[PDB]
Amino acid sequence: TSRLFVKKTIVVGNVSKYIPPDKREENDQSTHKWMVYVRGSRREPSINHFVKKVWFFLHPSYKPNDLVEVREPPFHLTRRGWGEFPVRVQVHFKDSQNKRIDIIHNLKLDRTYTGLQTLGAETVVDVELHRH
């Protein structure tokens, strides 16, 4: 409905934990566990108001689970891995008028190698959507 919008903040981040050989089974090449999350800003952190679902596109190595739909919050994706790669985060909005957006998030894996969770990276974008 017409020409008014709101600017909204969307944050895509990633955290990672290193998995020591002492904690992987015989045939498990996963050196890391990571968690990509999608969130709003400090002012309002819950994007459930205006977000319908999130599509996570991943590297072909994750086939057949390279495409993941998180419908209801928290919009998080946890997986095991060995490699860094651009994660394509595709957001769909509850309002039919606002078209979907892709956010390319560069996954950053931990290199402290202490086996503890660390903060990898963060991608921040401003989104426009029909207010009314």
Partner: peptide, 8 residues
Amino acid sequence: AARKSAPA
């Protein structure tokens, strides 16, 4: 082309 590399 889809590229993936390990940190270490």
